[PDB]
Amino acid sequence: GSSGARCYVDGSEEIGSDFKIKCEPKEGSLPLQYEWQKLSDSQKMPTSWLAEMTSSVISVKNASSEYSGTYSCTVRNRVGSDQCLLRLNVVPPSNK
């Protein structure tokens, strides 16, 4: 499939739901430099954003129904320096 960049997100929006993010840059050889970028009202995640600076695989909690934002991934390798688009959404279950 993708060559050099792997970006996708696994997170189901629910009060106390399941979150997960994955981003790994594998272009023929090991990458040079890469860092994550996101826009989430809950942006306060120092240790979490550190792992995001270089993650490969991440797990989060949907404990908050306000964790809906547009994520993003950035990789820079002489052999494949580009960006990525990631997304995460956490909200409350609309019961009928």
Short mmCIF file of C-alpha atoms in Angstrom, two decimals:
data_model
loop_
_atom_site.label_atom_id
_atom_site.label_comp_id
_atom_site.label_asym_id
_atom_site.label_seq_id
_atom_site.Cartn_x
_atom_site.Cartn_y
_atom_site.Cartn_z
CA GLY A 1 0.00 0.00 0.00
CA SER A 2 1.41 3.33 1.14
CA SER A 3 5.13 3.79 0.49
CA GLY A 4 7.05 5.86 3.01
CA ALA A 5 4.09 7.17 4.96
CA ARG A 6 1.56 5.33 7.09
CA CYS A 7 -1.18 7.47 8.62
CA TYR A 8 -4.57 6.56 10.06
CA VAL A 9 -6.62 6.81 13.25
CA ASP A 10 -8.74 4.40 15.27
CA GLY A 11 -11.02 6.14 17.75
CA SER A 12 -14.73 5.69 18.39
CA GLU A 13 -16.46 8.75 19.89
CA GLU A 14 -18.22 7.84 23.17
CA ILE A 15 -18.21 9.04 26.82
CA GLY A 16 -15.53 6.58 27.94
CA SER A 17 -14.96 5.13 24.46
CA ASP A 18 -11.84 3.70 22.77
CA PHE A 19 -9.12 5.81 21.11
CA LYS A 20 -6.02 4.95 19.08
CA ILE A 21 -3.64 6.68 16.66
CA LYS A 22 -1.01 5.26 14.31
CA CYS A 23 1.70 6.99 12.28
CA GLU A 24 4.89 5.38 10.94
CA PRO A 25 7.11 6.68 8.06
CA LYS A 26 8.68 3.68 6.29
CA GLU A 27 10.15 4.64 2.89
CA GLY A 28 12.49 1.85 1.74
CA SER A 29 14.93 2.72 4.56
CA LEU A 30 14.60 4.17 8.06
CA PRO A 31 13.26 7.80 8.08
CA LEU A 32 15.27 10.88 9.05
CA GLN A 33 12.91 13.19 10.94
CA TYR A 34 9.17 13.37 11.60
CA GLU A 35 6.77 15.11 14.00
CA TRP A 36 3.01 15.06 14.62
CA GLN A 37 0.70 18.08 14.36
CA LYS A 38 -2.90 18.40 15.57
CA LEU A 39 -5.70 20.82 16.34
CA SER A 40 -7.72 19.72 19.31
CA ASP A 41 -9.41 21.95 21.87
CA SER A 42 -7.94 19.52 24.44
CA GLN A 43 -4.40 20.19 23.06
CA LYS A 44 -2.97 19.91 26.63
CA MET A 45 -0.95 16.71 26.23
CA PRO A 46 2.79 17.23 26.95
CA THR A 47 3.77 13.62 27.52
CA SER A 48 1.19 12.55 24.98
CA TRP A 49 2.37 15.00 22.34
CA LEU A 50 5.93 13.82 23.05
CA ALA A 51 5.05 10.29 22.04
CA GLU A 52 3.29 11.97 19.13
CA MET A 53 6.55 13.74 18.16
CA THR A 54 7.61 10.19 17.39
CA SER A 55 4.95 7.58 18.07
CA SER A 56 4.41 4.86 15.42
CA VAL A 57 1.44 3.65 17.48
CA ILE A 58 -0.66 5.36 20.16
CA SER A 59 -3.62 4.67 22.44
CA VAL A 60 -5.94 7.30 23.95
CA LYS A 61 -9.05 7.44 26.10
CA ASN A 62 -12.46 8.72 24.90
CA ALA A 63 -13.35 9.50 28.53
CA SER A 64 -14.25 13.01 27.34
CA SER A 65 -17.08 13.59 24.85
CA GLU A 66 -15.34 16.84 23.84
CA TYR A 67 -12.24 15.14 22.35
CA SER A 68 -13.18 15.91 18.74
CA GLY A 69 -10.41 17.42 16.65
CA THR A 70 -8.46 17.30 13.41
CA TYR A 71 -5.14 15.51 13.83
CA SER A 72 -2.17 15.58 11.47
CA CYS A 73 1.16 13.86 10.87
CA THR A 74 4.37 15.22 9.36
CA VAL A 75 7.40 13.29 8.10
CA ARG A 76 10.60 14.52 6.48
CA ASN A 77 12.95 12.09 4.79
CA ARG A 78 15.36 12.85 1.93
CA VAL A 79 13.62 9.91 0.30
CA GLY A 80 10.06 11.01 1.05
CA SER A 81 9.50 14.23 3.01
CA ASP A 82 5.76 14.95 3.21
CA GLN A 83 2.75 15.45 5.49
CA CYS A 84 -0.36 13.51 6.54
CA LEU A 85 -3.96 13.94 7.67
CA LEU A 86 -5.21 12.23 10.84
CA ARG A 87 -8.57 12.49 12.64
CA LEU A 88 -9.98 11.70 16.10
CA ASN A 89 -13.51 12.12 17.49
CA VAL A 90 -14.96 11.70 20.99
CA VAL A 91 -18.55 12.58 21.89
CA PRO A 92 -21.57 11.35 23.97
CA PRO A 93 -23.80 8.43 22.83
CA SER A 94 -27.05 9.79 21.40
CA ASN A 95 -29.63 7.45 22.91
CA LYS A 96 -33.02 7.10 21.22
#
